[model samples]
Target: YEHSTVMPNVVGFPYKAHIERPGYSPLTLQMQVVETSLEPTLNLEYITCEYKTVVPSPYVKCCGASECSTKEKPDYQCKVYTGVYPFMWGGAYCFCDSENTQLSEAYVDRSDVCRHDHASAYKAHTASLKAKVRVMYGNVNQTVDVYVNGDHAVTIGGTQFIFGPLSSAWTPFDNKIVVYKDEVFNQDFPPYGSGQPGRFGDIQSRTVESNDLYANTALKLARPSPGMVHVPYTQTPSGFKYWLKEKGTALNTKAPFGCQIKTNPVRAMNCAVGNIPVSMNLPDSAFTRIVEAPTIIDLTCTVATCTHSSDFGGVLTLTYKTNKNGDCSVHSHSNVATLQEATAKVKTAGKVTLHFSTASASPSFVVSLCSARATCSASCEPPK
Candidate 1:
């Protein structure tokens, strides 16, 4: 079909092209000009009219599993605001579903767009199709063990309690317990030991302050019965504070001055011996050494000078720094139960300097330091 005609430059307005080709029926074409450049001619292809698949009954969803409730199922051509064209929506179109009482008067997608009429005459009714969808969380009961480190002694309800120093014979207690200087600790004083039931009776009125406590002590509370407990603790300037709850006894009351507690699953302890000269090579950031989490020992340095003596009878002093501004520090080898041979070599060298520079510089060696005195239960892995 070859034909030519002059048309107006009306932007975005659709033009109906009527073409009659010999014995074939007349055909109508719908097109619009987005813009016109030096080439004023517009090339268009004539193909068979194609319609989207018609949805016999569209699925109407209000929200996800949680928010929705009382789901509804019915034969309704519900129009929805698809927001925009979707690759997975299976070819749905948005229509202005005006005058909707349940939802805002916004445009929506005609799931059955293929069955609907042209855009100008399309219409939708009030949201008669409605449902409530909801989600639920299941609760499971779990037993959590509590650990408290208290070096001091206190009496609650005539029951004496002692905390700390590890050797208190607090039965059901692991004698191999090792604690650091300032670790988060918690255990009642006089620990429920010596054939005594470690369980306290109705002592919810007791409140342990920070002054009477050692260092960084945390407290854990029992999980409330019937429902769960959400008792959280905060670190005050002086000590820690926690909210406590009494068990289910039909007592509609809140208590004053709650005690603190710390909870953890039972872990194993391990003991290591021998002169282990673990080489701690400088990390990319050398100013700091690899210290386990939970403990912040600020003995790090970027550069330092260390002196030792060797069999040569001359003092060996080493001066080195981290290549990348990381924390670097040497531990006291003798202070720990480990690292004797490594310490001897350290003492032998008066000074073994470690300098890092461009091409013309000093030599480098493995940076080894003694491990600090820390506890190693069955699992002596690094602390988080």
Candidate 2:
């Protein structure tokens, strides 16, 4: 018997098929079909998200040769698969020579620290790499690389995953590594409790070791097992915005020319960027610190722009004399924009002065410090 039929786009809709054969009992089959639409998928978009290590410049040293030797044809020091080349950077490895039975393993080549006994030195140097990522705006791409030794963070699903890879040599960020997203966030904020939609949960991430951060999309995809798609940078769509926190506390949602977070959301989002005015300020402490407890001073701009005598803007400097018999100033300046958020760290023992003027504004720059528990905001409240 010849048979033909047409199906409709009704989900879970029932249907029956009839068949009759010579001398056979008439048969009927009951079935239902599922309907799906591809239209919803069109609403989604993707960008070329990527990350790159930007600090604690990398170095490679050879073993045995007093002046430093090189590997015959070096292999990736860290292993994720058998016979597979390591795609990222960081860590230790061994390559044997045919002429000698002596075995040499790291902390060695590509280890930067050549001395075997300087555990402290190895720990410090290996922990200083940082990286940045490219995030996009209206057809423009900007690099977002924030540091504070131990104060920088990457956020997802509203929760901020904070890790100071530069604070320790044994940390997960000890090398340019790819880690499962679940393992990184779960250690701090456990995830077994709620609805748990797996956006940030099921991906593998490439991150820099404490001062060493890696963000390369190409390398992340070259290998299979260690392959990942968790590039941290993303585009802030019209309905969404970016927030750069200061001292890991205050939030600056304002922008130049009096852009408000409510009215001009996109401009406000771009304003929160690192390159915007009321610019970069490297802490004097970044160059000279007394290795003592620091006093954390929080400051805020009274207004977005200063046009009157009561308004404050210009070169804002915190001058203090260190116990080391030297004077240092943590300098910053601004003009048309307000110092939306700023936190200054000074020696606990010093008498500090707040220098400000009509042309002065708040400095909005980020730096790294030491590792500690994250103190982010309520926007990123994790599950208990």
Candidate 3:
């Protein structure tokens, strides 16, 4: 517990504020503390702060994925006016109508969701957004696998007392394979999701839900006969991004990417991934020198070069299209440092156009193979 005191470094003191009635953009926080000590965390920064009132609506408010209505609620799913929103409850109103939420917002999970809805509009969770920790006490070394928005999130937290294995499967997502027993194991194999699956048998008070829109995270199993129960499928709304898997995991000598066969506890198995597109082939290996009826050079398959990256790992979106046919017109590799003047104008360019995007933020693995084959008889021609 060592301590020291020092001050003044380009001083400009006296900054006052009252900040009531929904705090406005309060930004009056001042801090100083570095030399370390007093539980000073490794190296961190906090101000992503939000949640104007209550807390816990992890249920987020939109980054992408829209449309809202009102099947109503026991807890989140359809209720929209879609207008003035900061986080909700009072800062603005969407009403969304149906049952009577007339008010409630701050759908958490932006990073930690609530910097304070006061845990963002009393923990306003529409679901499908998470970061979670803290409820887990123990100086955790901080567990994680990385990639948040590009999808795939892993954070295990310091283990205290862990136990659970008995698995149970079959759920065409929800066609049924009953047994439903899940201390953890299969957790509902197949895409089927019996409201997810879990907790020391018979779910005790049973409500079980996930609804499988694509199903995203939400596993929390533990109960000797008290609190902590989670097992999911999804709350609906999905373009993609749902992980924490084991069901039918068969693959791995190298990079099978999905692995989980009962070891539990080390956690971090946020499973699934992003980046889409496993393969795409457009005249991939074009060489039509075979249709020789009047052949001047016919290999309906040909190419020039329009490469792309991303085999999938969402580091988000990472897309790729690379389109072009007989209407061809593609160009964008020319800052021209003279690579023979970028192929000496590819034979006087003709209306060229081809666009492809898989957008990567960090997936340095590029492997697109079109095996080289072309002979569409003279247009781009070649192949005896």
Candidate 4:
């Protein structure tokens, strides 16, 4: 009778983690399976295995910036502290079963190690860090191909695959072949599978192994996932700006410089009050001479009233404005122009002017404004 080796717990043998912490920094972790047998194989027709990851808790406290342990928190409030535990976790399972078996299973058993004090802490940290990393670098549209014995296998979620593949070799017996299996993180094809081949009535059954590989291939036809959106640099004029605003602030609000206005200057005066305005003009190449019309500008400032030694303490409404010449102006004139009938004309006129104003006692208080002139074209294709 043919005998099979007992399978070792290779669940977390090649565990890895990709970390994204409080800061925008990234980290990678590589773990080697330890304190286990080096040889094992499975022969069951239907088998289900579970792996319990046991992570170590980070040291609570330490000292010194360079010498301080990432596992320990610093005592000094000013000194920043970080946990040594990497931020993400990646697991891989390898088994040598009958090639014809339709289904086989392996999973992380939370019940086994999640409740243990020491093990639970480690698992929690590992899982939490992995989740955080995924959130930061998750791109569903990205995919990576996997292979087994030079055969097409599976596709990973990102352009990069964290896990590697297994290797296998055939060994000749009296009238059968034994397969040797091993995991290979590097190199194209390592070795995996059992030393015993699947028995056939009289001939030897073919033995198969598993392994993971990755390639840096561009996904031209890929689209972003549900929570993700494809944002090309050209799609939204301010694609990077929008990304920064959305990811930076926890609150949902308009970007700092998203709005603008154009001043008709019904009556040329010292300055303008309230929200600033923006205007746009289409170039001759554009189909329509008139592009986007100038609209109400969104003002951003810290409004605070303080009682100082002087009598300059009251509700200060500060706003910003810009002109066609790419100049910024801060309006703060007590007697400034109002926007009762201000209109933005988008014709290819000789030149365009912008005005800003706010309430202030100083006759010539400095006004700050920002503006830009971009050449818009009708043939410009939107980002895909």
Candidate 5:
């Protein structure tokens, strides 16, 4: 008879097997018998015996029966057996198990992907100077970590980072600014650390004065000139009249008969008699020489007289002095006029007189008689 003892605790066994007539063999073996009969009947009915078809009872000695509950479900039983198989297999099996899950084998081989394209250094000798940092890169998808003196200054999104107006004190000798890309891979790229120099100079300088025109105030004068004189006229029925006659004489003579005379009717009628010429002699020491023709003489005077038929008058003459001897020489009187008369008239003829003088030879030299007359007209009019 073929006899076998049910495996004590198949679950606990390191390997599954059964004892055979020859020796112990794995339970995986299978046997089959072809025919069987309950009685010897003429019409033969066949029965088969299958050893592989009979599964071992999971309830065994060492393993609890409750633990075998999963065996009823074949798919679930396989999962349970594999989970604890590590203990049954031994440490050597653990090593072999890792063959499909090797760590280094699963990892990917990568190259250093971080680098700087254009790296530059700016060095300045002085402190408090500023320098700029600019970054250029093909792609900005990766992050760059910037460090100054080992302190994380900034993390940039794109390829560029600009630092400073940096001071020399904080970043003293050989100060460094490190730009690291893809830092997650622990790669150190070139142009990682560098510095820029500083510079100092004046941009603009200017000087301003203390006193400007806008800050002060004073007075200023306008006009002054020579050839300004005063004259007078007499009114009569004929018109306003003045005298032009020579005055004073050579010696002890009383002003050459007309030196200073009243404005009487006789003198007014004799004015145009060619007695007063339009010329005179000036000394060589005269200060100003005449440049242009004298056009007119402005005169200021007192009021004329009508009741007395006499009036006070004088003549103002504007002359041009020539430079014949390289000095003030011949004097040419071009314009002349009698002084304006007072609005009120004199009652008597003898009460009024005319005076003429020259600043030259006779500083007090009375030159000629300037005459005057009374007019019958109600209003006094001077010639233009």
Candidate 6:
């Protein structure tokens, strides 16, 4: 089909040729003045492009599992992953046994075969999308009615002969996004996204630098059935217990100060860890081993104390400042620990105080703070 359009000058604006091509942007052009003044003749040359099947990157999510019940050894687990290809979702990396080491040989079966539409990537992905639409010859030597999408951008008195069907009409290209991170980390997919519509959409990450996310938020501890127990000097590993002559040990009713998860809290003391057939009051020493082996050789026998290592399970709460330039410095705080690790761009602050069983077989609290790094780029879509 042929349509005529004047090669009018579009100085400030480029004429947009709205073609029904889904992904390829419509044609845009600036009018040639000199050529327009004389005679305008142009070619509506239709460029034919041979397209083929495309392979989209698939999304496979792995769910890892471990066998900890056996007293022998804690075994390594493989990722039980799920996939979302040119489609929304697919399979997982399942397992039957812990030592089947064949557990180690499995791979993602993108073999499921899928498809996508008008695809593109930020990484050097531009289609030659070849087209030979150019000017023709006459008095202006080379000029024709302006060509818009499939028609003319504007009406011209001159004649125009349109030719050729869109070699490859608007075809769809599928987009596939795969999101995955490690175990310590828990991923969150928000309701909507901002980046690539579907292609490598966006990946956001939250690292459990120390998922010991919560502190020993003191929830009234059982100051306990207050009392000093007397150890008969005869038990003599420095045998002397004070029962009842309680002289201020900066403690509290919130005595059993155990580190606890905030939500669904054992609302259950509401529990206990002891194998006593009958109800007999057992001293805290029952839980302490110091009572078992006495090692007082160095002669500096003054006072005694105890400590143990434990973990505070929660997410790392990061405190950092990012400059207008994206530079950052971070400091972290928790009931279990504190740390500061900073680069001109990124920073984290951390520390662990010694409850040294010298700090309770369990310090007033405990913290095994460590950090695992992950790169997260979520669909960074600005608000609509």
Name the best candidate (by lDDT). 2
Clash totals for all candidate models: 57, 32, 65, 34, 32, 57
Compared with the true structure, what per-residue lDDT tens digits does model 2 show for residues 166-192?
Answer: 322222211111112111100221121
lDDT of 5 by residue, 1-384 (tens): 122222111111111112222211111211111111111001111111100111122211112112223332111121112211122143212323212110000111111210111111122122221111122111122323222121224333321222222121221112211111111011111121111111110000011121111100011111111111111111111000010011112111232322221121101010111110011121222112223211112212332321211132233222222222221111112112212221111222212233322222212111111111221112222223
Tell me the tens digit of each residue's lDDT in model 3 across 1-384. Answer: 011112211112211211212211111112111111001011111111111111222222332234445532222233222222323242323333222122222221222222221000011111121122111112222422221122342323312211111111111111111121121222222322222322111111111222212122232221111111111222222111122122233211222223221111112132222211111111211111222111111113222332233221111111122222221111112121001100011122222222222332221222111211122111111122
- Residues 1-384 of candidate 6 have per-residue lDDT tens digits of 122233322221212221212222111111222211111121111110112111122223234332322221111113222111112121123232221111111111111111221111111111111112233211112434332234323212232333222232221111211111110101111212222111121211122121111111111111111122111111101000121122132111232322111111111020111111101122222121222322122111111222122232112232222222222212222233222222122222222122111112222222211111211111111112
Query: What TM-score fits each model?
Result: 0.12, 0.15, 0.14, 0.13, 0.10, 0.14
lDDT of each: 0.20, 0.23, 0.20, 0.20, 0.18, 0.19
Worst ten in a row by lDDT for model 4: 120-129
* Candidate structures ordered by TM-score, highest first: 2, 6, 3, 4, 1, 5
Runs of candidate 3 exceeding 4 Å displacement:
1-184, 187-199, 208-345, 349-384
**Ten consecutive residues with minimal summed lDDT in candidate 2?**
39-48
How many angstroms is residue 327 displaced in model 5 relative to the true structure, after the best TM-score fit? Answer: 19
lDDT of 3 at 267: 20
Q: Per-prediction RMSD in angstroms?
A: 40.5, 35.0, 32.7, 34.7, 66.5, 43.8
Which one wins by TM-score: 2 or 4?
2
Task: Report the lDDT tens digits of candidate 4 across residue range 64-104.
Answer: 12232232211111112222211211111112211111111
Candidate 1 wrongly placed segments (more than 4 Å): 1-316, 332-384
Model 2 regions more than 4 Å off:
1-384
